Amino acid sequence: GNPLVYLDVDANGKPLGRVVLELKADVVPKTAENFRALCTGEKGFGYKGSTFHRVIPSFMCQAGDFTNHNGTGGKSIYGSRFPDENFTLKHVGPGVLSMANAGPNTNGSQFFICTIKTDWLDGKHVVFGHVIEGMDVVKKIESFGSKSGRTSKKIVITDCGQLS
Numbered sequence: 001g002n003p004l005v006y007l008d009v010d011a012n013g014k015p016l017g018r019v020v021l022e023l024k025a026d027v028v029p030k031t032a033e034n035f036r037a038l039c040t041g042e043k044g045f046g047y048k049g050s051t052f053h054r055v056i057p058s059f060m061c062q063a064g065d066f067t068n069h070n071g072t073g074g075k076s077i078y079g080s081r082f083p084d085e086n087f088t089l090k091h092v093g094p095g096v097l098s099m100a101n102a103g104p105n106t107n108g109s110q111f112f113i114c115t116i117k118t119d120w121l122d123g124k125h126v127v128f129g130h131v132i133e134g135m136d137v138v139k140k141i142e143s144f145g146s147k148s149g150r151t152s153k154k155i156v157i158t159d160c161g162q163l164s
């Protein structure tokens with residue numbers, strides 16, 4: 001079936017707990033596979049140790065720049081960037097997992113988890129999964145954001161991997 005992966009997240013060195021994500025490989029296999037492998041780190045790089053760099057309350061929590069650690073970087077398992085696979089899944093509400101980008105066909109490793117329905121991103125960002133468990137952790141992360149996106153705590157993915 002679809003992969004289940006996890007992110008264990010600290011804020012200021014304090015564990016918040018675990019976010020478990022279903023990756024919709026049935027719908028977006030290439031995008032799911034990228035995220036899965038970045039969680040396990042099996043290609044020699046990935047999300048472990050990277051941060052949530054942009055968090056906007058009543059919007060989303062964005063993470064995944066493990067190359068520049070500032071929101072400008074990241075890379076996929078395929079190369080630096082890869083195409084928008086499809087826009088079949090929509091930004092339907094809180095918990096949606098979707099790819100950050102710098103315009104069409106610029107998926108790398110950066111991703112976001114929605115905290116509301118972000119319908120204006122439909123057809124622009126590739127949705128590829130959702131939160132199975134740990135929305136409480138996502139709400140904590142959200143509470144450490146700000147309007148500008150600047151975080152008020154250092155939010156770090158300390159560990160990550162594949163559950164199934």
Ligand SMILES: Nc1ccc(CNC(=O)NCC(=O)N2CCC[C@@H]2c2ccccc2Br)cc1
Pocket residue numbers: 060062071072073074081099100101102106107108109110112
């Ligand atoms: N591969 C790669 C991906 C993203 C980037 C930086 N781009 C980026 O942060 N763009 C904004 C973006 O992807 N998102 C996700 C929803 C949160 C933020 C957004 C999107 C649309 C409108 C406002 C905002 Br903030 C650089 C390289």
